[PDB]
Amino acid sequence: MRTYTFDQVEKAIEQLYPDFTINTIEISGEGNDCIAYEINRDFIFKFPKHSRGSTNLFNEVNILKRIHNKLPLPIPEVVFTGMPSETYQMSFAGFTKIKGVPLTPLLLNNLPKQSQNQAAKDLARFLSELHSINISGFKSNLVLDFREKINEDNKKIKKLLSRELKGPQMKKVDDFYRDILENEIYFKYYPCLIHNDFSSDHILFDTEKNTICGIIDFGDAAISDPDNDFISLMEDDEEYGMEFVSKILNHYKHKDIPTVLEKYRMKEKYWSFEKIIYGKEYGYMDWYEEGLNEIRS
Numbered sequence: 001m002r003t004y005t006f007d008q009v010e011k012a013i014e015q016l017y018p019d020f021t022i023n024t025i026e027i028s029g030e031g032n033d034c035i036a037y038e039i040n041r042d043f044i045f046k047f048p049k050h051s052r053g054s055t056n057l058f059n060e061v062n063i064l065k066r067i068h069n070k071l072p073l074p075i076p077e078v079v080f081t082g083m084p085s086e087t088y089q090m091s092f093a094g095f096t097k098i099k100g101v102p103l104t105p106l107l108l109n110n111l112p113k114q115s116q117n118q119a120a121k122d123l124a125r126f127l128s129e130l131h132s133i134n135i136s137g138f139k140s141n142l143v144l145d146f147r148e149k150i151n152e153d154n155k156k157i158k159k160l161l162s163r164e165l166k167g168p169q170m171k172k173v174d175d176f177y178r179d180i181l182e183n184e185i186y187f188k189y190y191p192c193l194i195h196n197d198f199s200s201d202h203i204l205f206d207t208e209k210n211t212i213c214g215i216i217d218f219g220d221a222a223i224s225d226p227d228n229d230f231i232s233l234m235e236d237d238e239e240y241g242m243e244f245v246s247k248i249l250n251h252y253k254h255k256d257i258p259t260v261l262e263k264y265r266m267k268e269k270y271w272s273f274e275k276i277i278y279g280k281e282y283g284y285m286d287w288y289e290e291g292l293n294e295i296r297s
C-alpha cells in the first residue's frame with residue numbers, strides 16, 4: 001500500500017483536468033482499496049492504495065459506465081478518470097456524490113415498521129434489476145469463477161500455513177477445502193452481475209424521506225453468484241439480521257433460501273482463510289493472526 005498528501009491528489013487531478021479548478025478537498029473515507037476524497041462538496045475521488053485496488057477502481061468505473069442509468073436506485077456516475085501508470089491500471093477516478101447517510105442496523109431498527117418493510121422492498125427491486133442485467137458483453141476479466149478462486153486460495157494457504165500448522169492442524173484444513181470443492185451447491189449457480197460488497201455501509205439512506213437513496217462502492221462488482229449480494233447482508237453483529245434479509249429474499253421471490261444459508265454458513269467459516277490471505281497480502285498483522293486462531297479450533 002501507499003498514501004498521498006492532499007497536494008498530491010490535487011496535482012494528479014489538475015494534470016488530467018486543467019479546466020477543473022478545485023476549491024474544497026476533504027478526506028471522505030478510507031477503505032482497504034482506495035482513499036475517497038470529497039472535492040468541491042459534490043464529487044468523490046477514489047485514489048488507490050495499491051495495484052490490487054487500482055484494478056478494482058478500473059473495474060468499478062467500467063461497470064458503472066456500463067450500467068449507467070439502468071438501476072432503480074441512484075449509483076455513482078463517472079465524471080473524471082485518471083490514467084494507467086506503472087503497476088496501476090487506474091491512478092484515480094471521480095464520481096458524482098450520492099447524498100444520504102448509510103443505512104446502519106441501528107438506523108434501520110429505529111425506523112418505523114413500515115419504512116423497514118419499504119427498505120427491504122427497495123433493496124429487493126434493486127438487486128432484482130441488477131441481477132437481471134444482461135452480462136453477455138463483459139470481458140472474462142469481470143467474471144468470478146469460484147472454483148479457481150478456491151483453488152488459488154488453497155495453494156496460497158498451503159504455503160502460508162506450511163510454516164504455521166503442520167499435519168494434524170492442517171489435515172483439518174485439507175478436509176475443509178476439499179469438502180467445499182466437492183460440494184456443487186457452491187458452484188452450480190447461474191452467474192449474473194453482482195455488487196459483491198452489498199452491506200449496510202454501502203446503502204445510502206435519506207432520513208428525511210425515510211427511504212433508500214443510493215448504492216455505492218462497485219469496486220468489487222463482478223459476474224458471480226447472486227446469493228452473494230444476500231449473504232453479505234446477514235451477520236447479525238455487523239449487518240442486518242436474518243429477520244430483515246428474509247423479508248428481502250421474499251420480495252425478491254428467491255426460491256431456495258436454505259442454500260442462501262448454506263452459502264452464508266460457508267463464507268462465515270471461510271472468512272478466516274480470507275484473513276490469512278489478505279492479512280498476509282496487505283500487511284494487516286492482526287488479520288493474519290485473527291485468521292490463525294479461528295483455524296486452530
Ligand SMILES: NC(=O)Cn1cc(-c2c(Cl)cnc3[nH]ccc23)nn1
Pocket residue numbers: 029030031034035036043044046076095096097098099204216217218
Ligand atoms: N472509500 C470509499 O468509500 C469509496 N467510496 C466512496 C463512495 C461514494 C461515492 Cl463514489 C460518491 N458518493 C458517495 N456518497 C457517499 C459515499 C459515496 N463509495 N465508495
